[PDB]
Amino acid sequence: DKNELVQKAKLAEQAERYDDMAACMKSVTEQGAELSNEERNLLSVAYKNVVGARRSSWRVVSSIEQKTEAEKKQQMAREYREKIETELRDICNDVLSLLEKFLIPNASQAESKVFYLKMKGDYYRYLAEVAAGDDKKGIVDQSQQAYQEAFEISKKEMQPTHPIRLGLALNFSVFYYEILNSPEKACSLAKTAFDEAIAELDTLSEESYKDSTLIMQLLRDNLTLWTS
């Protein structure tokens, strides 16, 4: 039963057992019906925590390795980095295939489609950070493609102030800056998202004033930081 599984995911969230919480939402997703947004929210919360723990661990260990003057201490760090990466690849491949088989093809509203497209760009981007030299360009493209598709839909079906459209423009501009290394492209994307949203603050709901404006601030923060 779905309701049983969601109740379980919710318990797991209260307890901060994100691995448990992810397994539940995995199953709920796999039942094959379109997820409510409460479920889409739980799925996302759980994978964000599970993958983010590895992604933070990978950073600590990877920056100890490449800050090493002792060949045996460094073979250790290399072995640990890669054990952590394989954990990370598993989690991303899980998500990516959940996105490929259920979430994107069942998404019947634009807002939903754009969110899952963004998620696929964001999960490929994570795989690109950790990719050998050989596979990287191909993975980078998968990431770029999902974001572009999300971007083309959002431009066409959503208000420039929709938090999901903003968030997409935030993550895509970062992808251009940090992953594709095109600061010129990162900047215009973020400038124009910001401007189009200022130009239409009429289209802001009493409900989401705070959330939209906050994201617009983070977009600006990157502008100023990427400008200097």
Partner: peptide, 11 residues
């Protein structure tokens, strides 16, 4: 937060 967190924004 809540609606910002599951939006999974870029670091």
């Amino acid at each position: 937060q809540g609606x910002x967190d599951x939006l999974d924004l870029a670091x």
